[PDB]
Design a protein around this ligand. Structure first.
Ligand SMILES: CCCCCCCCO[C@@H]1O[C@H](CO)[C@@H](O)[C@H](O)[C@H]1O
Ligand SMILES: CCCCCCCCO[C@@H]1O[C@H](CO)[C@@H](O)[C@H](O)[C@H]1O
Ligand SMILES: [N+]
Ligand code: NA
Length: 677
């Protein structure tokens, strides 16, 4: 079997045994000196997680509430790092290649995924530019070598509707060629008035074995979102407190007129080539091209009107964006012994090239009453247009040696990146340009006791281009993450249970900062995140599956020029916890029935960086019920019922500032039918 670039991990219920996210080569979770979580297909289905972001709500060290109920983008806040949270997603070993300085961030639909792997903390040594919180790797469904056919249909509240199919199998007598074809159409009204979500997608994959030494997998992914749900927010003033009227803004309130529009087309093609040279030497090339179009028209609230008392001031954003992106990763691995030491030595060259053409519009809109709005006044007073061509190039050369000797498992990593970023202002003709090089490193040591207890330590580094620029308008120095991590993992042999504790201390340097009167940003800011994560997978009964998590996060601006030094970032709960359980009857009359549910806790959050107002804590409840009607003599047919936020709590999930607060999703009920053959 082929380790390089594959997880190759067994999965049973909600627990995987192996990953490649931390190493680019199959490694037991138990023998990996980093915090790795895995969210299985079964967990996604059982919790009715409708997006990647929602799939993470049972994982420690992840906050799922950055823009509350919005499903437009996947925001995964890791270890309290909210900034550039959209850019944490990798798909099939490759950076998604969205542009986080634009509206062109992509979304991968969960129905195409086999599993979600989550790596905590700085991880640039294998991936290049990334955030200090970690990163998420989506693994797409791959061709099967036995015929597999699934049709599925879902119906819910809020006008939810989905149909999908998933067909796979061999094409030849010899079973050397196999396909998979997955398609999907879906819709929702949301909780919000006048809002639609809508998506049509298809993903063909073909896998071909040339010999026992070579597999090529060809992949396409075409997705059209002609509607983009809701992506707004409203003041703390009337959400966290009553405003004037003694009113609160409703969880269904819509701040825009029907001059609203979000149209996203994503067109991806790629391949994965796996080649065994020797029992020692293996090589792999992962490639993906992306081409997307985004069209946006959005009127949004921004603060209360100075003159008109229960009306919100509004503005308009308009965008027409075309994103092109190439990414390739070239890996060569040698597995070999030198005396008592076994080496798994990886060398790699990767390359990212991105161009985003953006035509931006903006203006002033009419004011809107925040209770009993009257739509139809959609005239916009337009400000100056703002058109850009943005380019990024990243070349990475990296080395890694995993050294296993006796019960020790060591990891040594080094990477050099050459980065070039350009911004051509097509309105003004001016061009900002920037080229630099960064070295990142990682060192891990883990001791595997033969009882399945594994203490470890890790030092790991990250960088990311700075989103801010100086006086001159050449960008600041890239931010930098540095983490010391101490952990303990434990799995009792055979028992399908797995427990981890992780302690972390992350420093992020060269963060943009200024005096508030000041014009120039300088790269003198610093952020420190430290804490504890606990994760438990317990499979008792063989009919009973449990997940539990606890997260403690202490994050602070340790150096700031703006008066917020020593404050806690907003959108950063100190305390979170979760628990999910699922029971299946094999035994009795009830064979085929399954019942499940859980609870999620988010602690209090600051609504603002100035730390003047709290978002209250909240506990949410989820539940499910499933039946295999196979058991009653009609095979491959099963149904499920899910309710997330079962008590229908009406709450603010988080705030970006005092002006922008986001409601959590109201009760979401779905009924699903799955038909195999
Ligand atoms: C069980 C709950 C189902 C309610 C679905 C929410 C849909 C509310 O929003 C709908 O959006 C349309 C688009 O402009 C409007 O024209 C409709 O009048 C409005 O009902
Ligand atoms: C879990 C242990 C964390 C110890 C480091 C915290 C002290 C401040 O931060 C440290 O500053 C040092 C420079 O003085 C650097 O060498 C370290 O990489 C950095 O983490
Ligand atoms: N504005
Ligand atoms: Na399957």
């Amino acid at each position: 079997v082929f380790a390089l670039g594959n997880n190759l991990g067994s999965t049973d219920g909600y627990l995987a045994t192996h990953s490649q996210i931390a190493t680019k080569t199959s490694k037991p979770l138990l023998e990996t000196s980093q915090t790795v979580s895995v969210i299985t297909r079964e967990q996604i289905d059982d919790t009715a997680s409708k997006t990647v972001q929602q799939a993470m709500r049972y994982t420690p060290g992840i906050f799922t509430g950055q823009v509350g109920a919005s499903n437009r983008y996947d925001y995964v806040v890791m270890r309290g790092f909210a900034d550039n949270s959209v850019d944490n997603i990798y798909l099939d070993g490759l950076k998604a290649m969205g542009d986080s300085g634009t509206f062109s961030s992509m979304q991968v639909d969960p129905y195409f995924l086999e599993r979600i792997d989550v790596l905590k903390g700085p991880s640039s040594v294998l991936y290049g530019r990334s955030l200090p919180g970690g990163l998420v790797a989506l693994t797409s469904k791959k061709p099967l070598y036995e015929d597999y056919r699934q049709i599925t249909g879902s119906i819910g509240n809020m006008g939810q509707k989905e149909m999908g199919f998933d067909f796979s199998g061999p094409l030849d007598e010899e079973k050397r060629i196999a396909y998979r074809l997955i398609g999907l159409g879906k819709g929702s009204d949301t909780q919000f008035d006048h809002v639609k979500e809508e998506r049509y997608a298809i993903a063909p994959t073909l896998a071909i074995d040339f010999s026992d030494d070579t597999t090529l997998t060809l992949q396409g992914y075409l997705q059209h979102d002609p509607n983009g749900g809701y992506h707004g927010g409203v003041p703390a003033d009337g959400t966290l407190s009553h405003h004037n009227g003694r009113h609160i803004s409703r969880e269904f309130f819509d701040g825009e007129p029907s001059k609203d529009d979000f149209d996203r087309t994503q067109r991806m093609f790629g391949y994965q080539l796996e080649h065994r040279i020797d029992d020692v030497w293996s090589a792999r090339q992962n490639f993906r091209y992306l081409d997307s179009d985004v069209d946006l028209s959005q009127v949004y609230a921004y603060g209360w009107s100075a003159s008109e008392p229960n009306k919100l001031n509004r503005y308009f954003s308009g965008a027409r964006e075309h994103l092109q992106a190439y990414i390739v990763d070239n890996m060569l691995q040698a597995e070999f012994a030198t005396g008592a030491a076994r080496h798994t030595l990886l060398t790699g060259l990767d390359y990212q090239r991105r161009r985003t053409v953006v035509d931006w519009r903006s203006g002033s809109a009419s004011a809107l009453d925040a209770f009993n709005p009257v739509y139809g006044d959609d005239a916009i007073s337009y400000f100056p247009d703002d058109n850009h061509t943005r380019r990024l190039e990243q070349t990475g050369v990296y080395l890694q040696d995993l050294i296993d000797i006796d019960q020790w498992r060591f990891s040594l990593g080094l990477r050099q990146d050459w980065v070039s970023v350009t911004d051509k202002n097509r309105s003004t003709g001016s061009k900002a340009d920037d080229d630099w090089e960064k070295f990142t490193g990682r060192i891990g040591a883990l001791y595997l006791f033969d009882n399945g207890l594994a203490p470890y330590v890790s030092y790991s580094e990250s960088f990311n281009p700075n989103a801010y620029s100086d006086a001159s308008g050449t960008p600041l120095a890239p931010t930098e993450g540095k983490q010391w991590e101490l952990g303990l993992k434990f799995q009792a042999p055979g028992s399908n249970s797995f427990y981890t504790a992780s302690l972390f201390h992350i420093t992020q340097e060269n963060v943009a900062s200024k005096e508030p009167q000041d014009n120039f940003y300088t790269s003198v800011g610093e952020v420190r995140s430290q804490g504890l994560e606990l994760e438990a997978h317990t499979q008792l009964s063989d009919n009973l599956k449990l997940l539990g998590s606890y997260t403690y996060t202490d994050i602070t601006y340790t150096k700031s020029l703006d008066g917020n030094q020593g404050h806690t970032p907003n959108q950063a709960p100190k305390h979170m916890a979760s628990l999910w359980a699922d029971y299946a009857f094999d035994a009795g009359p009830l064979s085929g029935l399954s019942i499940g549910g859980g609870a999620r806790y988010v602690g209090e959050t600051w609504a603002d960086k100035e730390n003047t107002l709290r978002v209250p804590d909240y506990t949410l409840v989820d539940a499910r019920i499933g039946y295999d009607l196979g058991k009653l003599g009609l095979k491959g047919l099963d149904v499920s019922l899910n309710a997330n936020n079962l008590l229908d709590k009406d709450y603010v999930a988080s705030c970006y500032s005092l002006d922008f607060c986001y409601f959590g999703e109201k009760r979401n009920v779905t009924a699903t039918v799955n038909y195999q053959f």
